[PDB]
Design a protein around this nucleic acid. Structure first.
Lengths: 90, 103, 16, 78, 11, 97, 97, 79, 105, 93, 16, 11
DNA sequence: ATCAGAATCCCGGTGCCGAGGCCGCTCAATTGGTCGTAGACAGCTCTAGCACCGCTTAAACGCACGTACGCGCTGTCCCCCGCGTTTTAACCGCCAAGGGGATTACTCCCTAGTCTCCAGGCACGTGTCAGATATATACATCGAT
DNA sequence: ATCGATGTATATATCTGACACGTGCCTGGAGACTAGGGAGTAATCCCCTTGGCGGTTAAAACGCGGGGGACAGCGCGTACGTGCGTTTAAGCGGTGCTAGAGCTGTCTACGACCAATTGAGCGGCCTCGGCACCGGGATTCTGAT
């Protein structure tokens, strides 16, 4: 499960704030659901263009297709920043 | 590690493994799990910050499903994203039609 | 701005 | 056995929905609607548990059945 | 809006 | 000594919209679910969490339906919801032909 | 002279436009509207004629369904003339905003 | 400037097909707004699909896929 | 007859369905019976809709199925209408009906 | 430069059900799209079912369960009967 | 209506 | 119903 | 109200163009053989769902009152329909052209697959503080005066 | 306007069990390496989208008159909300039992994979009759009398 990572994010955004077990399960389900939606959209996109490889482009377009305006813009910015950072370093 | 190499907190390796095992496509790129993990991290951070604000407004130091429901429904964009979803023990947003109120 | 963290990850994971 | 959904329970549900006054005939209609919804969801869940050759309707089966009708549910060990 | 001010403020 | 009609209803509306627990008694709902499932494969068994999830979904669905019903009734310049309002809301939602 | 009563022409219009199947919006203005709407998302775009035809089909079907629902809404309020409030109610109940 | 292309008699014909007997004068502007919103929602997804394929012409399949995204299929524009 | 459809006594390309299943990567492997079942189901559904479409076309004194006939056949059956609830048929029109209160006295 | 479709098979089915009725090109395309849509729905449900039970092969049972999940009521019953008969006949040969 | 089809399907296979 | 009597009667 | 005037269908005669049939071929489905692995199957174990009893109470139920609300009835007046004229732009046909989609040939670089290894993550155990509960208190509401 | 009677937020004190953390172990992710094919690039061909031009004419705009229906108002019956007294069964705690979920080990039936083969289906071509269209007459159908 994503309990540890959700916890680290929470402590990063709100230093002194706990989270109930039920709320942790809620967040775990939410993360799984969003991941499944994005992956399914990327798979559909790849199968559309006769492609056979999910790349950063497919996930970026899936994000732009799923999330609403400002949310999608910020998510795309974050993803691009992370990808460039990970590529530059090694 | 890959997750730490991208300045992220979410598991890049676990996301890559899930993408591979989920047979979404024949092959999976290198930056695809990184991008996906970054997006998941951003969404989680957003919803968690809103829920923490809601919990603080309730004078509680512990997130509960009611706080998550309040945070989701009070934000129009998250509400649009989380349209057809039910949160266990989330309750409903407090509203009353204006005509029903007394004179 | 976590280039130091990226370098450490490239070293720590490689230190293993 | 459907009459187990008592009148005050439906009244409480409507109150949560933000309903001030309630007609007398509302309760039977609500019972019928609830029965239809439960029938659909339970049929799908029982089919799911049939395919697994199990005899116990797990919560994940209910979650799958709900997701079938475009009603995603959160917080059940998904 | 407030989200853009909040999204940039991550650390 | 005697609250005028509509006041206690408003207080109940404020109360139940604030709290989050379920509103149907657990045991009758569980019995209803079991009796409904009896039509399909018999001698079934349910995890407690499964019945809990069914109850949560039913509560959410009914609350949303009642909200739409209240909107319909208000549209007709009334305050009392009537079965025709439920039928109209369901018909528009697409749950009915 | 001769003059029909108010309403009877509308009935035969309903019968005619329900019997037939062709499109009701003029093709050229709809194509121009689609082109302008898409112009801001990305410049110098091109459209297959079949793409514009599909857009028109979907838009007309959606509008017809919405008009059916809002007619039901208006009738529910003991009215015959549909008003904007019925359209807003139908869209609100449908969930789209 | 171009939303007026959806003229009042056209909206009246659409409503007549829908089965409407009388129409209020303010219906037309609301219908124009609703149609504009729907068209924006579909066309944005169609253009995104096109941009992903590095094309410059929106094809019918992109519109079909956008409609499928909006949970609304459409038959008769290529399998 | 080489074709698996001839073995199954169907009219749909069992081999083509098998290839589509294997290519669409729905799963790692595909059983031998699955294409037969899927082809049979598709053939039955096609026959069911086409019979009603032909009935509608005959009612309209025509002898060629056109999208209007398909729309009439789909909307005049509760089962198929429920199946194709979210489907829009191009050039299909709408089912002819008028609310009772609109009719004159 | 080779398109595939179900036009021929739909035509044979039509000639078997209505021995004298023809079908327009637009209606043929609509039927083709309908067949593709139903196939995609059933296959996706079968894939989800297989992934849910940790299996890795799509068998007849999974396809039957997907059909029972998708088709409403009497349609589902008749389709299940047809598929079962077809599989029994195929295995007999 | 079924046995004849099965026999015809199993007949011409090896004879080609 | 009548569909089952009709579905079986194919030839 | 029966009759005049306006759609509406239904008959018959023509033209045509899109559906229906034929042919070559070619590439995709078949037939044959293997091989290794997913899955069927027998066996054990232990969790957990089911069944039953006692007992408190909190909720459900039944009843009486009355009042606010649903609903029928009227007037009105203004907004929308039907219709005749005039204006306008869709559209149909035709012509030009150039952007750009669709194919095809090559290179290579990015990803699948393997082996190794070690550290991040997960199950388990434990302490304590955020929160649940109780109670007296002060304050906000509200309904008849 | 007002104040007594109710309901509710508030502050303080107490108890508890779920959460937050520390620890040991282990298995899955990372590092290093190789092989091969997916796709990125370029070069080319030709469909097909856009743009313009002009005559037709059907549709849209516009103005006008009037009937009808939306809406406000009023009155009247009645059916829900409120509160009270009586009933009952939901719920909690506890016990006991056993079914089946889940995991493990074994075996083998079968589906992926590959190779040679041929005919099923598809692209292209040609032909005619189903249907659209035109035109007139019988048929309903509606509104004033």
């Amino acid at each position: 499960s994503y309990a540890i990572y959700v916890y680290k994010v929470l402590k990063q955004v709100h230093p002194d704030t706990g989270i109930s077990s039920k709320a942790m399960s809620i967040m775990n389900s939410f993360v799984n659901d969003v991941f499944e939606r994005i992956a399914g959209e990327a798979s559909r996109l790849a199968h559309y263009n006769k492609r056979s490889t999910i790349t950063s482009r497919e996930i970026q377009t899936a994000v732009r297709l799923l999330l609403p305006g400002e949310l999608a813009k910020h998510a795309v910015s974050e993803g691009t920043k992370a990808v460039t950072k990970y590529t530059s370093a090694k | 590690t890959r997750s730490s190499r991208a300045g992220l907190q979410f598991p890049v390796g676990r996301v890559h493994r899930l993408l591979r095992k989920g047979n979404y496509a024949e092959r999976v790129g290198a930056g695809a799990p990184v991008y996906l993990a970054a997006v998941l991290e951003y969404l989680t951070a957003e919803i968690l910050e809103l829920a923490g604000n809601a919990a603080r407004d309730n004078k509680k130091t512990r997130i509960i499903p009611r706080h998550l429901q309040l945070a989701v429904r009070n934000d129009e964009e998250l509400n649009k994203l989380l349209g057809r979803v039910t949160i266990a023990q989330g309750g409903v947003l407090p509203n009353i039609q204006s005509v029903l109120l007394p004179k | 701005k976590d280039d130091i963290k990226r370098v450490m990850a490239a070293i720590e994971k490689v230190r293993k | 056995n459907i009459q187990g959904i008592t009148k005050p329970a439906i009244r409480r549900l409507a109150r949560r929905g933000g309903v001030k006054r309630i007609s007398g005939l509302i309760y039977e209609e609500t019972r019928g609607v609830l029965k239809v919804f439960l029938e659909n969801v339970i049929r799908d869940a029982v089919t799911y548990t049939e395919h697994a050759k199990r005899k116990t309707v797990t919560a994940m089966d209910v979650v799958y059945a709900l997701k079938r009708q475009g009603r995603t549910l959160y917080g059940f060990g998904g | 809006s407030g989200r853009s001010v909040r999204a940039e403020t991550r650390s | 000594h005697r609250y005028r009609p509509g006041t206690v209803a408003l207080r109940e509306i404020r109360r139940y919209q604030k709290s989050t627990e379920l509103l149907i008694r657990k045991l009758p709902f569980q019995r209803l679910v079991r009796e409904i499932a009896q039509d399909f494969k018999t001698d079934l068994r349910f995890q407690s969490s499964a019945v809990m999830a069914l109850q949560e979904a039913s509560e959410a669905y009914l609350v949303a339906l009642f909200e739409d019903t209240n909107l319909c009734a208000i549209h007709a310049k009334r305050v009392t919801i009537m079965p025709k309002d439920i039928q109209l809301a369901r018909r528009i939602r697409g749950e009915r032909a």
